[PDB]
Amino acid sequence: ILPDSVDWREKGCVTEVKYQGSCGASWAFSAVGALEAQLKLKTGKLVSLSAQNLVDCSTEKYGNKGCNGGFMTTAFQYIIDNKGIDSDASYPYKAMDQKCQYDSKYRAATCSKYTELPYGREDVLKEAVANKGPVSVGVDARHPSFFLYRSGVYYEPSCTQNVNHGVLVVGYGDLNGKEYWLVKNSWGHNFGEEGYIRMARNKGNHCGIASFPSYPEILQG
Numbered sequence: 001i002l003p004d005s006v007d008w009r010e011k012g013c014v015t016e017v018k019y020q021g022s023c024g025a026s027w028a029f030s031a032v033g034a035l036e037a038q039l040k041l042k043t044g045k046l047v048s049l050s051a052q053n054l055v056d057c058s059t060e061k062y063g064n065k066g067c068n069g070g071f072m073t074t075a076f077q078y079i080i081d082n083k084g085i086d087s088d089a090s091y092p093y094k095a096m097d098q099k100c101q102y103d104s105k106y107r108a109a110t111c112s113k114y115t116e117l118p119y120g121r122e123d124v125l126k127e128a129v130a131n132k133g134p135v136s137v138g139v140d141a142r143h144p145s146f147f148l149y150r151s152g153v154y155y156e157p158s159c160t161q162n163v164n165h166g167v168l169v170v171g172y173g174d175l176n177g178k179e180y181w182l183v184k185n186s187w188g189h190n191f192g193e194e195g196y197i198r199m200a201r202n203k204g205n206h207c208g209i210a211s212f213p214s215y216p217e218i219l220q221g
């Protein structure tokens with residue numbers, strides 16, 4: 001039924017790794033990354049979407065607090081309600097809270113719907129990654145080992161299933177008997193493997209990778 005390995009970068013569905021800096025905007029980068037892939041699949045164009053638009057505009061009404069944190073689910077609902085999100089090129093990332101400056105002239109995507117997956121189900125997450133595209137997730141990143149990660153399949157014995165950092169699952173695989181999730185972070189290219197981390201998969205929802213998964217869709221019409 002499902003492929004043993006997936007890597008959506010190979011289909012040209014994933015934009016360059018971004019750098020969040022001192023603004024706690026991982027939630028926004030995680031949401032735009034998932035939508036960028038659906039935009040590519042639908043239109044054939046790969047376009048970075050504006051994380052800053054989410055930080056500045058998907059705020060208290062959506063239970064978000066910009067650089068202090070937020071949620072991918074309500075970021076998607078903002079895009080739905082707003083009938084768009086701007087390109088990153090038109091509305092670039094400044095790592096600061098700003099006045100909402102959404103301009104529909106520069107709309108680069110819409111969102112038709114989003115779907116939340118069941119907590120802790122790594123099987124369901126695997127299916128969504130294979131059959132839908134990259135999936136927005138949270139992870140527990142409050143361990144020095146995460147910040148210091150350079151390469152390999154990451155396993156942190158003190159990790160919890162409680163999440164605090166948004167990332168994007170762009171694939172999965174197995175390196176000689178160690179299964180992993182292929183994860184895009186937003187701490188620049190100097191983090192991990194060119195901005196990516198391979199995180200232990202089917203090890204009991206390691207670091208809460210499958211705790212709160214969601215993905216958007218852009219439908220024909």
Ligand SMILES: CS(=O)(=O)N1CCc2c(c(-c3ccc(Cl)c(C#Cc4cccc(CNCc5ccccc5)c4)c3)nn2CCCN2CCOCC2)C1
Nearest residue numbers: 024027063065068069070071137138162163164165166212
């Ligand atoms: C602990 S937990 O794991 O048990 N869990 C408690 C329940 C929970 C968590 C996450 C979640 C999923 C994915 C991510 Cl990436 C994050 C995150 C994060 C993050 C990223 C950067 C910075 C901070 C710092 N935080 C401060 C803050 C204050 C105010 C708002 C936001 C952030 C947090 C959280 N989803 N759900 C369920 C949805 C809750 N609802 C969201 C609203 O309306 C609809 C319902 C966390």
